[PDB]
Write an enzyme that holds these catalytic residues in place. Structure first.
Site, PDB file in Angstrom:
ATOM      1  N   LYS A  39       0.825  -1.195   0.000  1.00 10.74           N
ATOM      2  CA  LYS A  39       0.000   0.000   0.000  1.00 10.74           C
ATOM      3  C   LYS A  39       0.869   1.258   0.000  1.00 10.74           C
ATOM      4  O   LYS A  39       2.101   1.201   0.131  1.00 10.74           O
ATOM      5  CB  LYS A  39      -0.917   0.012   1.216  1.00 10.74           C
ATOM      6  CG  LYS A  39      -0.195   0.318   2.503  1.00 10.74           C
ATOM      7  CD  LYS A  39      -0.825  -0.388   3.679  1.00 10.74           C
ATOM      8  CE  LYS A  39      -0.078  -0.046   4.982  1.00 10.74           C
ATOM      9  NZ  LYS A  39      -0.989   0.111   6.148  1.00 10.74           N
ATOM     10  N   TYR A 272      16.361  32.601   1.076  1.00  7.41           N
ATOM     11  CA  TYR A 272      15.347  33.463   1.679  1.00  7.41           C
ATOM     12  C   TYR A 272      15.683  33.822   3.125  1.00  7.41           C
ATOM     13  O   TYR A 272      16.308  33.054   3.858  1.00  7.41           O
ATOM     14  CB  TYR A 272      13.972  32.788   1.623  1.00  7.41           C
ATOM     15  CG  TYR A 272      13.411  32.720   0.227  1.00  7.41           C
ATOM     16  CD1 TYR A 272      12.949  33.877  -0.424  1.00  7.41           C
ATOM     17  CD2 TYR A 272      13.350  31.505  -0.459  1.00  7.41           C
ATOM     18  CE1 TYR A 272      12.443  33.820  -1.716  1.00  7.41           C
ATOM     19  CE2 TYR A 272      12.843  31.437  -1.742  1.00  7.41           C
ATOM     20  CZ  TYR A 272      12.393  32.589  -2.369  1.00  7.41           C
ATOM     21  OH  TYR A 272      11.908  32.488  -3.652  1.00  7.41           O
TER      22      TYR A 272
END
Ligand SMILES: Cc1ncc(COP(=O)(O)O)c(C=O)c1O
Ligand SMILES: Cc1ncc(COP(=O)(O)O)c(C=O)c1O
Ligand SMILES: [Cl-]
Ligand SMILES: [Cl-]
EC number: 5.1.1.1
Lengths: 386, 386
Positions: A39, A272
């Site tokens: 899964k 940044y």
């Protein structure tokens, strides 16, 4: 080699996977079978190729998180049983029957209505069902001896349903205190003795996960569900220390440097917020991976990559698609060199457990949150393919 | 309504994207145009439908992270110009020319070899190029007035290339302190007035992101690059307080309760690790979302959802595909109720920015790591489609 426009990729080693499955084969009873769990896109490794390979080398059933994950497997050619572990809406009953996907269920009302739905269509196959008993996980399943007797009877009258299994799940089998795992175990064998003294025969029983099968192999019964150990990763540091099975990790992550420069002119600010100022002769390399790929922003002024057998640190804040690294004063590097983000390079290594501890999480989350926009390559027998 | 096997999903409101674009148009000079940023699957909202809408309501060009993200847009019909903000390897020069993708460049030797590749093939397509100037971000681009003039020289001498823009990036334009944003600007003007004192004519000029188009509209020059503002979210708390423009958020995340039970018999433990123990008349409800969908494991025992206009808390550890929540000592609800995880319900709200604060990150990360196994539905003029 490998030819990309944006140069970042994953490699999955399928020779590691097959080895992992033999180690587990030779530990548990000869009489027990193995259900491979793939899964969440094979825990981030890719579900189609790992399942294909697992069924050639020891496994005989598979488990997924939803009907839609299972349909992807049938469209790829696979005819083995597929069990859905979560809850499925009555809205997908006829379509699960059509694709022959096995469903979990645990209520009398759900079974009666799913029976009538296929009754009113005849031209159908029958729908196979596993019953979930909740012995202590608290998530899904039935919980009393009387409730479960009601559900076995509603299922035995239903002409379009068919009973192929019954299971449970341990919530603390990876922990050194075995108290609650043993109490779960005798709750479960209890309920099964009751069903038997009623004259009811039983189908396939399964209860173990990776940690349970390694640590309590006498709980194997008919079948086990192998998940995290298929991919070469241990459930907990405790289970690794027991030193009873040797597994080998299958996944690694890489890129190539995009640019190299000396910070001579000014300003000498990086990324940044300008949280990092280089020195007049530091060398800064730029690499094509960011937090939208699954590389955590919390690794900002903190993480490492491997360049030429050594660790170089991350300089400044992580951005959405790119990070910068410091090669030092008068560095040494070229546009085009290869960098390792997870895995091995010469001697050095940065493991997925190391990164998960640094972020206060578990290896499970670090691999299965790797974006599908990163391409995956498979190695089998020394050779690459896709 | 909507019918799903596993009941979890995303709603994106395109009426809000349209109102976001109009607020920005009125606020900047009519001289200048808008380039919409849809890289990373449209910051998680889906690249295809957001880009269509945007081109219909005020944008005229697009930006992405890589040649592969642009090819998904061309395969769906979009014929507008698309710029790649990152580095593209020379191995993709011929392919970019064939799908008419525009690329960033800033090196003399890359210019030279790119032009050779297309010459040695005839090629009727000239490849469009934008030049990146590094004034303070220290990520990519040319750094000195002298060296920009070599690249301009080499680009002009290449008949198979085409110069269609020149740009830069502000590294701190969302901060109360405007020192560094005035310096980068000053340097960038210096380099282009140096250039046009030598006879050179200049093409499209752009420097602004969301924050800098709001605080310094006199910088819009020829064009701006609108990214986070498009999706209806503010780049920082400071920019949001300046109260100059009004934005509306576009994205909600919902699910349907899978099972419900009251914790009467023992044991009453809930989830892995047994970190939460229920009361004997507590109601516990199971949801189909987990950390492989992008719901951080760090929200264990501390996050919330909305059920019937209230906040209910997470109970126990988050797992790969499911969470558990507590409804109280005799709570109310049925298998089937709708739950809101990010967004608005009845009178209540859980905003993406509150969730980011809880995890010490920024809203960019929360939304751009939502997984591709969750379906996205689109609502336009108050109705839905996929
Ligand atoms: C019911 C069930 N069985 C098996 C597995 C595989 O678990 P593990 O990865 O710990 O082996 C999981 C996960 C699960 O939820
Ligand atoms: C160079 C560049 N320009 C513009 C943008 C869009 O930025 P924002 O979402 O802050 O407006 C990004 C991201 C970027 O990397
Ligand atoms: Cl369960
Ligand atoms: Cl840049």
């Amino acid at each position: 080699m490998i030819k990309l426009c944006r140069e970042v990729w994953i490699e999955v080693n399928l020779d590691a996977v097959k080895k992992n499955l033999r180690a587990i084969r030779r530990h548990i009873p000869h009489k027990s079978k193995i259900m491979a769990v793939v899964k969440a896109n094979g825990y981030g490794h890719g579900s189609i190729e790992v399942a294909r390979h697992a069924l050639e080398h020891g496994a005989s059933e598979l488990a997924v998180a939803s009907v839609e994950e299972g349909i992807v497997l049938r469209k790829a050619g696979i005819t083995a049983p597929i069990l859905v572990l979560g809850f499925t809406s009555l809205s997908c009953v006829k379509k699960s029957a059509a694709w022959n996907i096995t469903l979990s269920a645990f209520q009398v009302d759900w079974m009666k209505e799913a029976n009538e739905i296929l009754e009113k269509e005849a031209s159908a196959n029958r729908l196979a069902i596993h019953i979930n008993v909740d012995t202590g996980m608290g998530r899904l399943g039935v919980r009393t001896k009387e409730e479960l007797l009601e559900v076995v009877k509603a299922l035995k009258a239903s002409k379009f349903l068919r009973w192929t299994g019954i299971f449970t799940h341990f919530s603390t089998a990876d922990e050194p205190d075995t108290t609650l795992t043993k109490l779960q175990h005798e709750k479960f064998i209890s309920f099964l003795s009751f069903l038997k003294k009623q004259g009811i025969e039983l189908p396939t029983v399964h209860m173990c996960n990776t940690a349970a099968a390694i640590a309590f192999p006498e709980f194997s019964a008919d079948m086990i569900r192998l998940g995290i150990g298929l991919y070469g990763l241990y459930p907990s540091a405790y289970i690794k220390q027991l030193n009873l099975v040797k597994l080998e990790p299958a996944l690694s992550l890489k890129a190539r440097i995009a640019y190299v420069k000396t910070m001579r002119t000014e300003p000498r600010t990086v990324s940044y917020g300008a949280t990092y100022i280089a020195e007049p002769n530091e060398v800064i390399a730029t690499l094509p991976i960011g937090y939208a790929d699954g590389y955590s922003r919390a690794l900002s002024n903190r993480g490492f990559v491997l360049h030429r057998g050594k660790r170089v640190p991350v300089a400044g804040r992580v951005t959405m698609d790119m990070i910068m690294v410091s090669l030092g004063e008068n560095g040494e590097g070229k546009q085009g060199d290869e960098v390792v983000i997870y895995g091995k390079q010469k001697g050095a290594e940065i493991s997925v457990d190391e990164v998960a501890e640094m972020l206060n999480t578990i290896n499970y989350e670090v691999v299965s949150t790797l974006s599908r926009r990163i391409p995956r390559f498979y190695i089998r027998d020394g050779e690459i393919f896709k």
